[PDB]
Amino acid sequence: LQAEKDRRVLQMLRENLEEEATVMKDXXXXXXXXXXXXXXXXXXXXXXXXXXXXXXXXXXXXXXXXXXX
Amino acid sequence: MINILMLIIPILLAVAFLTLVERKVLGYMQLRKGPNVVGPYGLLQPIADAIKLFIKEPLRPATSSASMFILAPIMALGLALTMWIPLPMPYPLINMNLGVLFMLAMSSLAVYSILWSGWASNSKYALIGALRAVAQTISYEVTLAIILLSVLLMSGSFTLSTLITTQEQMWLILPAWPLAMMWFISTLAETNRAPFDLTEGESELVSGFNVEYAAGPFALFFMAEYANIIMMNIFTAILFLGTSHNPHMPELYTINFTIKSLLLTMSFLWIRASYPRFRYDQLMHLLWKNFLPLTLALCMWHVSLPILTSGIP
Amino acid sequence: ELPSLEDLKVQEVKVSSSVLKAAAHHYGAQCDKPNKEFMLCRWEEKDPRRCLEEGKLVNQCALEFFRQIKRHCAEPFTEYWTCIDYSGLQLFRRCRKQQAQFDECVLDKXXXXXXXXXXXXXXXXXXXXXXXXXXXXXXXXXXXXXXXXXXXXXXXXXXXXXXX
Amino acid sequence: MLYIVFILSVIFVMGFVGFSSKPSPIYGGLGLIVSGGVGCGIVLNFGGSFLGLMVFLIYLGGMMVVFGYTTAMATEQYPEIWLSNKAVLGAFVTGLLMEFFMVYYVLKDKEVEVVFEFNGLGDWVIYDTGDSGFFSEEAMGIAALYSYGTWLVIVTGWSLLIGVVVIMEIT
Amino acid sequence: XXXXXXXXXXXXXXXXXXXXXXXXXXPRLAFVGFLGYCSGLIDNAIRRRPVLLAGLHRQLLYITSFVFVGYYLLKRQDYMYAVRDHDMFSYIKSHXXXXXXXXXXXXXXXXXXX
Amino acid sequence: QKRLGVDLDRWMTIQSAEQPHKIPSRCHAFEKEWIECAHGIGSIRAEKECKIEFEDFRECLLRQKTMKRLHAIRRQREKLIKEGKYTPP
Amino acid sequence: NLMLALLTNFTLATLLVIIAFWLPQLNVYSEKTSPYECGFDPMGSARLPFSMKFFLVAITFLLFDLEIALLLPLPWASQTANLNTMLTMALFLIILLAVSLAYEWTQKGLE
Amino acid sequence: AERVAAFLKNVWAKEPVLVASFAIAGLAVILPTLSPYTKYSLMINXXXXXXXXXXXXXXXXXXXXXXXXXXXXXXXXXXX
Amino acid sequence: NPIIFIIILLTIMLGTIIVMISSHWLLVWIGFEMNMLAIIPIMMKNHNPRATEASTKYFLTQSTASMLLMMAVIINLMFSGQWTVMKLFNPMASMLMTMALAMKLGMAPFHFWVPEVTQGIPLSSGLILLTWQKLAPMSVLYQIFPSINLNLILTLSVLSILIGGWGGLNQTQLRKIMAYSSIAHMGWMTAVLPYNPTMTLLNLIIYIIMTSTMFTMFMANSTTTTLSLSHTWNKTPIMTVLILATLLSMGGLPPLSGFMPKWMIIQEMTKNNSIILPTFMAITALLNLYFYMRLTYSTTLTMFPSTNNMKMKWQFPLMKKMTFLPTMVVLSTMMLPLTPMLSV
Amino acid sequence: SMVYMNIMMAFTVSLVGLLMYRSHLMSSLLCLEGMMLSLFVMAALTILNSHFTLASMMPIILLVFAACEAALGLSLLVMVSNTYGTDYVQNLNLL
């Protein structure tokens, strides 16, 4: 169960570096406080947010019922 | 993927080599010599029919229909040969999340082959063989699911992989004594070469899904209809037979599994020769009126048994 | 949102291969005190950011568990590991004959215990860490409660309707 | 290639046009097999093999009863193809413009919609579910239950008793 | 009030607030008793029977049933009007700022001619 | 309900209840807040005090607040072609 | 893959039709007929209702098939929930189905 | 006998399958209530854990120990 | 017919209980479908060419309506999540919700099935079912009175009395007159739902009692105005006085119980400050009075309907509540002003 | 969100299908099972994404009632042909 949270933290730090690189000049994106207005529980929900790029890795992680190897 | 291609081409040959057994065993049952002239024991005749019926035979129906009709032999093979995929075997091709659900759903979808052949000819002569094929299948789909449920509650879940492991000491024929006798009758729900059977053979009425079809579509129907007979024979050898598992040696399982199925493969052709047709009305009275209260009483019995004595996967 | 540090917790984390972990259920008996305290932290406080410090001790003890087996009685451990991967996912079936060679070598050392039946969920607390019981996610009570008064009505003189 | 469910949802609506644009209960009957069977794949890809294959068990079996009244009762006069009639084909050609023209806006940026919600892309967001549960996994993994909803068992048992008695009075 | 807040949902009688005292031989009860007697007059018109008033003595069932149901109906009436007044008076005291008093004033008003 | 049930109960209707076995809901963290906010009568009838917690609940099931955010990231990556590209994975 | 397994069987099946479609060709005369099987000109042209006979027994299947689908929890649900509470409810659906078939005995129909 | 033995043999003579439909289904209701073995099956059903164990904070508690093999709570020992 | 007819009638009673005692949105959907399976067998009974037309018309113009209700139930999963019968939350959900209920209660654009269905029933006892079925979806609307857009419920109140007040004028069939009298009274029902939910339940109590009496007065066979005309001059003379009393109450008149709806509906509407809407409600209510006025001329006038056949034998009907209910339908004005509180 | 918009668009076509009548009455009973099919897919996706487990029983109940109306309407279709000849929306007597 720790291995799940170890991967989810590493995926979050990769997303933080990508957001700072893409948005610099004209667009307004703070990334702080996040989408949720509660900011006390902070759900992971790493399925829609997890892996922004690379199609080969994303397709294998999303599908479990499909193919099923 | 190589496994799927190694499960169609040798399987179509098994439906081809069935034609030997369909008149060799059936022949000796009627005291007559079957295949003899063509090959050493007529072994070259089953492969000769593939050269006979496809390359030279040309028919397309007269008044016909549009896209449908020729859609039906595609529906015949493309739904009955797919049934080989969820089979547990020694090792299954893509082991299903729930096994027997895919086996029961695609079998009912395979009935459509004889259904769309009713609208193959717009003329009313062909659809009488189709309307008869409705009732000879529609009623027997009730018990086919119920008798499954009594066996499935006795052993494991819907997954076909667990059904091999559950039979380690004794077969499932002995606990399910009246239910095993039901699966010699309920297996013949689909239009199969049998005495119970459906509207497919000649005898009294015109041949269903054959009078409208050619040779080429009609030849493709037999490669699907006789394929279902092997399919039910294997499926009975999983649910009721087992003997041994052995995950280390697949060789010991593959020989032992085939002998159990082949004894059942002869048994349906044994049924076919022996007994006359049950009639359209009276087949609806064998089940529903007489057998459905019996199966539900055993279904009631098989609900109590895991509660009476511990039997939960 | 405030994410965790880029350095991350636990240096050289996790075992190299799976099924190896599933083959040994002795990890439940030995080294349970760091495992259960992380478990107690995570259910009380749902945030992974708060109880990552206790999770560092879990991975550190995990490396200490496997190194003990690799030093003493390694050959029966490897033969049991090759047996479980040869089959599908039987876990304990068919490999019970090779399981006789295992455990018996481990019994020579004091670092051996059988599961027997079940864990039955054990409760123990010996760390606490700032107690931590009331946190949740709630911020507002929303006007506490609606105003309610009980005094019992007498009769009320005359009905409110037009005809009384 | 990334999309799995989205391509199947196109085939789902494709069969549904042959209902508003009436093609007779044989060509319109095909819709419950073609779009119905692909419609199971929409359920299957999200999860739960039970409820996904439950659509196959009834909507093919119950369609055979419908087929028992396609060659019966009323419709046996002319086949009536959806490619022949001018009143029928006109509804199909406008029916495809309700589906195929919508997919044209999906490619590049968010798609324009009649509803207030924007569609966007959503390839990895199509699943929108974490692993979480492992042993006895999925909400659909233990879906059907007699416990908790004990009142629901009685009324379902009642409704399947009423019909058998009622249809006998009608016929 | 339409929705219950103090009282528990689904109840035939009040029970929680029983202290109110029901009416004894009320003028309203006599009219419901007259309606019970009126039903015992018109039933002999539908089923053709001699005399409306001096007919069958099954009329006593019609008088009793209207009084019995009516007594519980009148009990619900006096209860619900009391709760309505109880909630209204409690609302003014809890807020205080919502209500304002103004008394004793001399102000000019336009008078009509002819 | 116009008439409510007494003694015997046939509930298991609302979200975040006693689970089927033990498996919890995906939106259980936001489900707990909505029950805690609207347990009093003067909250949903007012529909102003629980406005903050309802908007957070809308984010859970629909994911519309996260959908428009992730749409902007994927568009900018597609717009920047052959000028400023990064690929750590 | 389930998709790659199902399509490869389906594409091989439809390809065999094409082999039997294009290879045999020489002449197509006004020779093919509507009814066939027995011969002669069709007295019943196109389509006519026929119907009836099995109208009640077919309808009951559509009603019964839903109940068997509701019986499918039995081997898969009875794992976590209490058995004593389930026993009264699990049998209950099977008992009432026998009651409906008992009402089916008093005049079954024309079939 | 008027209907116990006199009417029972009439069901055997005409439509004999009706006897089995009442007898086997009838025993399926009577047996799970009277037999002293049905309570054991529910015990193992509750004992088998589907979800992971939960740790509770200990502050003056009886029948609660560590995860190691010790007498705590109850722990199933019903038949091996 | 002998035993199972009582069971079929009981399942409508039990079906409404599922709707009445509910917390889940799929549970009421079951309750609506419990009615579908149980009314249609009593719709047929004798099996007529007229009954076959009406039964299929009642099925198709109600089962498809409930299917629109299930969409609104599914939007309650799409938006707001929770399966609770309290609020719809979404304005998009409420639009498909209200129009589904309008097929049973609103009537203003969905009245079309009613006159054909009511005439299609062969039995006088079967006529009670349609007036009693309307109790079920009213209990749903009593629960979800907030969130719903008042602009498209009050149109189902104003327009319904217009078509109800016009649709009965050109009809001689006695069942058809009562079919549009239903639409006329259902127009008032949809008007109280935005303006104070109490008294709306009492509106039904006044309506159901008044209509259940009406059809039980037609236990002596009558299907047309001219057939009900021969009632005092050939059959029982004192029976027509009670028919006169019920018809004079069906239209809003003060010395009868049928003014108690008109009492509180306008009273509660004016408290919310609305003048132009309840004025139009009163003028259109006169159009409702005209049907009963022409039908009181079958009890007051001579009209010459004597005929050759004359009845001498005493009539023995069922008459379930033909004695207790008309007394509450005639002289409930003095024991009435305090009754709004007693209902809810 | 994205997948929901396609199956909602399939619902609207089947909505028109129940309101459109041409010659035969058989089209309505296909669309009755058609509209229930579209509602079933909508229910399956909503419950599974934001997991319920308890409320995943509800569409199974819905699927039972999906054909409860459909079986009764199809049996009513039988008796119309017995009174007339062929079931027609074009052929009706009542006003």
Please report residues of H whose CB lies closer than 8 A to that of C40.
55-57
> Which amino acid would we find at residue B137?
T
C12 Rama class: left (phi>0) / alpha (psi -120 to 50) / beta:
left
Token pair of E40 as six digits: 């015992």
- Is residue G96 within 8 A of residue D154, CB to CB? The reply is no
Chain G residues within an 8 Å CB radius of D75: 47
Cβ–Cβ of I341/E84 closer than 8 Å?
Answer: yes
- Tell me the shortest Cα–Cα distance from I232 to chain J, in angstroms: 30
Range C57-90 burial, b when 16+ CB lie within 10 A, else e: bbbebbeebbeebeeebeebbeebbebbeeeeee
Q: From C143, which residue of chain F is nearest by alpha-carbon distance?
A: F49
Closest CA to J50 of F25, H40, E56, B4: F25
Nearest CA-CA partner of I281 in I150, I158, I156 = I158
Chain E residue with CA closest to C158: the answer is E81
Which chain C residues have a beta carbon less than 8 Å from that of H60? none
Instruction: Give contacts of H51 with chain F, Cβ < 8 Å.
Output: 21-23
Retrieve residue B69's tokens: 């009709």
DSSP letter at I270 equals H
C159 part of contact set with chain I, CB < 8 Å: yes
For chain D, the chains sharing at least 3 beta-carbon pairs closer than 8 angstroms are A, B, F, G, H, I, J
- With contacts defined as CB-CB under 8 Å, which chain G residues touch J86? 49
| Rounded Cα distance, I324 and E39, in Å | 6
Find which of E8, E85, E88, E92 to mutate to test the C interface (most C CBs within 10 Å of its CB).
E85
Residues of C with CB under 8 A from a CB of B: 86-88, 90, 93-94
Total CB pairs under 8 A between chain C and H:
74
- Cα–Cα–Cα angle for C107, C110, C113, rounded to 5 degrees: 65
What's the token pair of residue I242? 């009670």
Question: What is the Cα–Cα distance from C91 to C25, expressed in whole angstroms?
Answer: 10
User: Measured between CB atoms, does F8 come within 8 Å of chain C?
Assistant: no
D125 to F63: CB separation less than 8 angstroms, yes or no: yes
Contact of F43 with chain C, judged by CB distance below 8 Å, is answered with yes
F6 to E5: CB separation less than 8 angstroms, yes or no: no
J86–G49: do the CB atoms touch at under 8 Å?
yes
Kindly determine whether residue D128 and residue F23, on different chains, have CB atoms separated by under 8 Å: no
Angle between helices D49-58 and J58-66 (to 10 degrees): 10
* Token pair listed for G80: 């976590």
CA distance F66 to chain I (A): 16
Nearest to D129 among A47, A58, A59 (CB): A47
Please check whether residue D129 is in contact with residue J51, taking contact to mean a CB–CB distance below 8 angstroms.
yes
Residues of F in contact with H50 (CB under 8 A): 21-22
Considering only alpha carbons, which residue of chain D is nearest residue I79?
D117
Residue to substitute from F28, F53, F56, interface A, most A β-carbons within 10 A: F56
Q: Tell which residue, F39, F6, B162, J42, has the closest CA to residue C140.
A: F39
**How far is the first Cα of chain D from the last one, in angstroms, to the nearest whole number?**
53
Taking CA–CA distances from G62, the nearest residue in chain B reads: B138
d(CA J88, CA J95): 16
What residue in B sits closest to A67 (Cα-Cα)? B94
DSSP string, B70-83: THHHHHHHHHHSGG
Interface subset of H 14-73, CB within 8 angstroms of D: 50-52
Burial of B194 (0-12, 13-18, 19+ CB in 10 A): buried
Instruction: State the best of F4, F8, F44 to mutate against chain E, taking most chain E CBs within 10 Å.
Output: F4
**Token reading at B135:** 């009732």
What resolution in Å is listed for this PDB structure?
4.3
Structural contact between residues I339 and E77, judged by C-beta atoms closer than 8 angstroms = yes
**Cα of F72 to nearest chain A Cα, Å:** 10
Task: With CB atoms and an 8 Å threshold, state whether E10 touches F5.
Answer: yes
- All residues of chain I having their beta carbon less than 8 Å from the beta carbon of residue F29 are none
Query: In this structure, what token pair is assigned to residue J46?
Result: 């909503």
Q: How far apart are CA H71 and CA H64, in angstroms?
A: 8
Q: Residue F26 is which amino acid?
A: R
Question: What are the backbone dihedrals phi and psi of residue C23, each rounded to the nearest 5 degrees, phi first?
Answer: -70, -30
Distance in Å, alpha carbon of F10 to nearest chain G alpha carbon = 14
Name, in order, each residue with C-beta under 8 angstroms of H37's C-beta and a sequence gap of 6 or more.
B308, B309
List the one residue out of B223, B216, B210 whose CA is nearest residue B51.
B216
Cβ contact (<8 Å) for I11 and D162?
Answer: yes
The size of the A-D interface in CB pairs under 8 A is 40
Instruction: Give yes or no for D145 touching F (CB within 8 A).
Output: yes
What does the alpha-carbon distance between residue E71 and residue H63 come to, in Å, rounded to a whole number?
60
Per the structure block, which two tokens stand in for F44?
């949903």
Task: Using CB atoms, list chains with 3+ pairs below 8 Å to chain A.
Answer: B, C, D, F, G
For J88, the 3-state DSSP assignment is: strand
Q: Is J40 on the interface with D (CB under 8 A)?
A: yes
Q: Do chain E and G touch: 3 or more Cβ pairs under 8 angstroms?
A: no
Is D98 an interface residue toward J (CB < 8 Å)?
yes
* Of the candidates C100, C94, C106, C98, the residue with the CA atom closest to the CA atom of residue C65: C106
Alpha helices in chain C (DSSP H): 20-23, 33-44, 52-71, 75-86
Interface touch D164/G100, C-beta < 8 Å: yes
I203, with CB counted inside 10 A (0-12, 13-18, 19+), is buried
Say if G68 is an interface residue toward chain J (CB within 8 Å).
no
Residues 6+ apart with CB under 8 A from I275: none
**How big is the CA angle at H67 (ends H63 and H72), to the nearest 5 degrees?**
20
Contacts of residue J78 in chain G, CB cutoff 8 Å? 55, 59
Cβ distance of C151 and E86 shorter than 8 Å? yes
Chains that touch J (3 or more CB pairs under 8 A): D, F, G, I
Answer yes or no: are the C-beta atoms of I53 and J94 closer than 8 Å: yes
F20 touches chain G (CB under 8 A): yes
| D135: chain H residues, CB-CB within 8 Å | 50-52
Strands (E), chain I: none
| Residues in I touching J27 (Cβ below 8 Å) | none
Residues 6+ apart with CB under 8 A from D41: D5, D8, D52
Identify the H or E element spanning E83: helix E59-95
Tracing tokens 């099954």 back to the chain, one arrives at E58
Do F63 and D129 count as a contact with CB atoms less than 8 A apart?
Answer: no
Query: Shortest Cα distance from E9 to chain C (angstroms)?
Result: 17
Q: Does F69 contact A35 at a Cβ distance shorter than 8 Å?
A: yes
> Counting every residue, how long is chain F?
89
**β partners of residue J88:** J24
Sorted by sequence, the CB contacts under 8 Å of residue F32 that are 6+ apart come out as C136, C137, F16
What are A31's two structure tokens?
Answer: 């990334």
Cα separation, C106 vs C76, in Å, equals 9
